[PDB]
């Protein structure tokens, strides 16, 4: 959890949020994720989520669905994942790296030695995406054990009692739901509700990153402007991976061209 | 926190994305409201009695089980409103949406049955419904597919992953995770997360509660087993749950074997699979070594699910119920059998169910047992795909 703590106070130094992209680990093709990745960070990445792919992703849209879908055609599994998380460490040291994970692939064959694997691999952050607080409680104590951040998740219409639990429970970041639904960038989200983002700083909560429909730099600033510590993109960085899977130079000049916009608009 | 326990033994749980745990507390505490209302109870009742036709009969075989010591019934859920048992709880959960102020419902089907139900109660109580299907089942229990749409359902084709009933409950899942503030989730069968497979169970128990009564005044005891196919758990779990505590009465549940279980190809993850965490519950699945969820496979588009319900993982567990597995080959033989000997046409997945009662009493003809099988639905909508086997052979 230190890298996500060092680079909050880095980025309130600098008057800074924080943009943090998505990707599925693997899609297209394990080199050209790793490829991908690279290009995100010298973007200007403050962090990076990332997903295994995982046969039934049941919070994510099409656009998601069908980055598991390339990755899975790769022939990517999580024991390939763990060797692409490596070297990303071995090649940056100190960004944060958050996995997204559905609960079955950390269950699978026990949650201890997943998180011990994540820890000895250099990974800062697990989110699972089909665990909600009330069933935590085994994920979030091996995260722990092992010095992972468990993320946890403030909904729109979150009430005391979970804002409570989410502030208590999670390390790392508090991932702020702009909205019901499941991933897209076409279904964009309302503003950060501020009482919420109010709300997590008076409990002491771990600084809040906006995510869901999160396409366009505009975003992003408004993110930012209303409290949130910094803003997650997925689909609108996966759709740039699509779009271009005939011309792996362009998908990275486009992915980068995009990064740079949405870290601008951060600083803002 | 909850009103209820969502777990049986380690098996259940709420594992949903967060957003949609108040809507899961919501139902949960609706339920418990409604159960202790007469009103809603009578509701219910009448619509059961009036609209579905129950009590539904219970009918001794008469010919196929001539020359052996088993007498054997069948609980007629063929004979519901709608053609299967899947009409009961759709009646009662229609009434939960009603209760919450949703105008809109959100189903998943595989043989259609449970989105003809959803679909009949939709335009009986003015809801609004949309109903996911796999493309293979759309092809492979068309007749359904006409019924839905006559009634002014939306039925939207799933093509993704094994386009069938595991992908039709994921694009379920998801679109409610969006559109639960004004749509209810009309799950159909005794699975997914906390309170499904509770009130499932007891919105379909009327069937175990119908076949005591009626096999008491018929034979003057208990049956010696009841038997039902388990596809998600509701029609084994409705026979099952007033014999629990009869601790004489066996309950014998049949997952799909599909090609035979050697084979890989089946939908029986109670007996071959392995504990996992999908579709909102903690329950037996079948996965790969490294946790993804397998493609099952069945004759029967009811049966052909990955997962099973967490009340029958827990029942297995204890030795209360014995879980066995009947082949495609085997259920088509029993299908015809019915038809040909009884003169009733069984739905392929009830014809699994009655292909092990028919084995019981093969295997051992001079054994002394009272049998029921749980008759789950008819077989209108799979006499084209029977026709076309027997046909591709030579009967
Ligand atoms: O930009 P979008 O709309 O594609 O959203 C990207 C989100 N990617 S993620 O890993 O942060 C992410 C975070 C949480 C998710 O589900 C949960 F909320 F239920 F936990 C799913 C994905
Ligand atoms: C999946 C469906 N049917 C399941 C089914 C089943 C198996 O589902 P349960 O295990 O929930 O009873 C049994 N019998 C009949 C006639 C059925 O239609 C459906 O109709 O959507
Ligand atoms: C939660 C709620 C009610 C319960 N009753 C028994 N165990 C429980 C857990
Ligand atoms: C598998 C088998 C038959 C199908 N019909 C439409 N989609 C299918 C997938
Ligand atoms: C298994 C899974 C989902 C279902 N919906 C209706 N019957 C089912 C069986
Ligand atoms: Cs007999
Ligand atoms: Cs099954």
């Given at each position: 959890m230190?890298?996500?703590e060092?680079?909050?106070?880095?980025?309130?130094?600098?008057?800074?949020?924080?943009?943090?992209?998505?990707?599925?680990?693997?899609?297209?093709?394990?080199?050209?994720?790793?490829?991908?990745?690279?290009?995100?960070?010298?973007?200007?990445?403050?962090?990076?989520?990332?997903?295994?792919?995982?046969?039934?992703?049941?919070?994510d849209?099409?656009?998601?669905?069908?980055?598991?879908?390339?990755?899975?055609?790769?022939?990517?599994?999580?024991?390939?994942?763990?060797?692409?998380?490596?070297?990303?460490?071995?090649?940056?040291?100190?960004?944060?790296i958050?996995?997204?994970?559905?609960?079955?692939?950390?269950?699978?064959?026990?949650?201890?030695?997943?998180?011990?694997?994540?820890?000895?691999?250099?990974?800062?952050?697990?989110?699972?995406?089909?665990?909600?607080?009330?069933?935590?409680?085994?994920?979030?104590?091996?995260?722990?054990?092992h010095?992972?951040?468990?993320?946890?998740?403030?909904?729109?219409n979150?009430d005391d009692?979970?804002?409570?639990q989410?502030?208590?429970?999670?390390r790392?970041?508090?991932?702020?739901?702009?909205?019901?639904?499941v991933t897209?960038a076409?279904?964009?989200?309302?503003?950060?509700?501020?009482?919420?983002?109010?709300?997590?700083?008076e409990?002491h909560?771990?600084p809040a990153?906006?995510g869901?429909?999160?396409?366009?730099?505009?975003?992003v600033?408004?993110?930012?402007?209303?409290?949130?510590?910094?803003?997650?993109?997925?689909?609108?960085?996966?759709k740039?991976?699509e779009?271009?899977?005939?011309?792996?130079?362009?998908?990275?000049?486009?992915?980068?061209?995009?990064?740079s916009?949405?870290?601008?608009?951060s600083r803002? | 926190t909850?009103?209820?326990?969502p777990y049986?033994?380690?098996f259940?749980g709420?594992?949903?994305?967060?957003?949609?745990?108040?809507?899961?507390?919501?139902?949960?505490?609706?339920?418990?409201?409604?159960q202790?209302?007469?009103?809603?109870?009578?509701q219910?009742?009448?619509?059961?009695?009036?609209?579905?036709?129950?009590?539904?009969?219970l009918?001794?075989?008469?010919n196929?089980?001539?020359?052996?010591?088993?007498?054997?019934?069948?609980?007629?859920e063929?004979?519901?409103?709608?053609?299967?048992h899947?009409?009961?709880q759709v009646?009662?959960?229609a009434?939960?949406?009603?209760?919450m102020?949703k105008?809109?419902?959100?189903?998943?089907?595989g043989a259609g049955?449970?989105?003809?139900?959803?679909?009949?109660?939709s335009?009986?109580?003015?809801?609004?419904?949309?109903?996911?299907?796999?493309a293979?089942?759309?092809?492979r229990?068309?007749?359904?597919v006409?019924?839905?749409r006559?009634?002014?359902?939306?039925?939207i084709?799933?093509?993704?992953?094994?386009?069938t009933l595991?992908?039709?409950?994921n694009?379920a899942?998801?679109?409610?995770?969006?559109?639960?503030?004004?749509?209810?989730?009309?799950?159909?069968?005794?699975?997914?997360?906390?309170?499904?497979?509770?009130?499932?169970?007891?919105?379909?128990?009327?069937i175990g509660?119908?076949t005591?009564?009626?096999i008491?005044d018929?034979?003057?005891?208990?049956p010696?087993?009841?038997?039902?196919?388990?596809?998600?758990?509701?029609?084994?779990?409705?026979?099952?749950?007033?014999?629990?505590?009869?601790?004489?009465?066996?309950?014998?549940?049949?997952?799909?074997?599909?090609?035979?279980?050697?084979?890989?190809?089946?939908?029986?993850?109670?007996?071959?699979?392995?504990?996992?965490?999908?579709?909102?519950?903690?329950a037996?699945?079948?996965?790969?070594?490294?946790?993804?969820?397998?493609?099952?496979y069945?004759?029967?588009?009811?049966?052909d699910?990955?997962?099973?319900?967490?009340?029958?993982?827990?029942?297995?567990?204890?030795?209360?119920?014995?879980?066995?597995?009947?082949?495609?080959?085997?259920?088509?033989?029993?299908?015809?059998?019915?038809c040909?000997?009884?003169?009733?046409?069984?739905?392929?997945?009830?014809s699994?169910?009655?292909?092990?009662?028919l084995?019981?009493?093969?295997?051992?003809?001079?054994?002394?047992?009272?049998?029921?099988?749980?008759?789950?639905?008819?077989?209108?909508?799979?006499?084209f795909?029977?026709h076309?086997?027997?046909?591709?052979?030579?009967?």
């Amino acid at each position: 959890m230190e890298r996500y703590e060092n680079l909050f106070a880095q980025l309130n130094d600098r008057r800074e949020g924080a943009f943090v992209p998505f990707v599925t680990l693997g899609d297209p093709g394990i080199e050209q994720s790793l490829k991908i990745i690279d290009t995100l960070i010298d973007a200007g990445a403050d962090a990076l989520e990332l997903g295994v792919p995982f046969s039934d992703p049941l919070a994510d849209g099409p656009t998601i669905q069908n980055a598991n879908l390339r990755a899975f055609a790769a022939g990517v599994t999580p024991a390939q994942c763990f060797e692409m998380l490596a070297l990303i460490r071995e090649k940056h040291p100190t960004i944060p790296i958050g996995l997204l994970m559905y609960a079955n692939l950390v269950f699978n064959n026990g949650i201890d030695a997943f998180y011990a694997r994540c820890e000895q691999v250099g990974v800062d952050s697990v989110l699972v995406a089909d665990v909600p607080v009330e069933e935590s409680a085994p994920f979030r104590q091996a995260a722990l054990r092992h010095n992972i951040a468990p993320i946890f998740i403030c909904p729109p219409n979150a009430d005391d009692d979970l804002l409570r639990q989410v502030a208590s429970y999670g390390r790392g970041y508090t991932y702020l739901l702009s909205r019901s639904g499941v991933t897209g960038a076409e279904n964009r989200g309302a503003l950060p509700l501020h009482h919420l983002i109010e709300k997590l700083k008076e409990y002491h909560a771990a600084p809040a990153l906006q995510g869901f429909g999160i396409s366009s730099p505009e975003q992003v600033s408004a993110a930012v402007r209303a409290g949130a510590a910094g803003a997650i993109s997925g689909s609108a960085i996966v759709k740039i991976i699509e779009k271009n899977l005939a011309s792996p130079k362009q998908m990275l000049a486009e992915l980068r061209s995009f990064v740079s916009a949405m870290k601008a608009a951060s600083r803002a | 926190t909850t009103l209820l326990n969502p777990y049986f033994g380690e098996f259940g749980g709420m594992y949903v994305p967060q957003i949609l745990m108040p809507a899961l507390n919501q139902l949960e505490e609706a339920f418990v409201s409604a159960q202790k209302d007469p009103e809603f109870q009578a509701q219910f009742a009448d619509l059961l009695k009036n609209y579905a036709g129950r009590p539904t009969a219970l009918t001794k075989c008469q010919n196929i089980t001539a020359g052996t010591r088993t007498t054997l019934y069948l609980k007629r859920e063929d004979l519901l409103h709608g053609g299967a048992h899947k009409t009961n709880q759709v009646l009662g959960q229609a009434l939960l949406a009603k209760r919450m102020g949703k105008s809109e419902i959100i189903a998943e089907t595989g043989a259609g049955q449970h989105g003809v139900a959803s679909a009949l109660a939709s335009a009986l109580l003015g809801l609004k419904c949309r109903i996911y299907m796999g493309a293979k089942d759309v092809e492979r229990q068309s007749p359904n597919v006409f019924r839905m749409r006559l009634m002014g359902a939306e039925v939207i084709p799933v093509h993704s992953g094994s386009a069938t009933l595991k992908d039709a409950c994921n694009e379920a899942l998801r679109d409610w995770s969006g559109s639960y503030e004004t749509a209810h989730y009309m799950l159909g069968t005794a699975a997914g997360p906390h309170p499904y497979p509770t009130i499932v169970r007891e919105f379909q128990r009327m069937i175990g509660e119908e076949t005591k009564a009626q096999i008491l005044d018929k034979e003057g005891r208990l049956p010696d087993a009841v038997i039902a196919c388990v596809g998600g758990g509701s029609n084994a779990i409705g026979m099952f749950a007033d014999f629990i505590n009869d601790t004489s009465v066996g309950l014998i549940g049949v997952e799909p074997g599909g090609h035979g279980i050697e084979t890989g190809e089946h939908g029986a993850p109670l007996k071959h699979g392995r504990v996992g965490i999908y579709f909102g519950m903690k329950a037996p699945m079948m996965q790969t070594a490294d946790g993804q969820i397998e493609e099952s496979y069945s004759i029967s588009a009811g049966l052909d699910f990955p997962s099973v319900g967490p009340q029958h993982a827990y029942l297995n567990s204890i030795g209360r119920a014995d879980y066995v597995s009947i082949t495609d080959d085997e259920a088509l033989e029993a299908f015809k059998t019915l038809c040909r000997h009884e003169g009733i046409i069984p739905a392929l997945e009830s014809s699994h169910a009655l292909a092990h009662a028919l084995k019981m009493m093969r295997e051992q003809p001079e054994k002394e047992q009272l049998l029921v099988v749980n008759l789950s639905g008819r077989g209108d909508k799979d006499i084209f795909t029977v026709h076309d086997i027997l046909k591709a052979r030579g009967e």
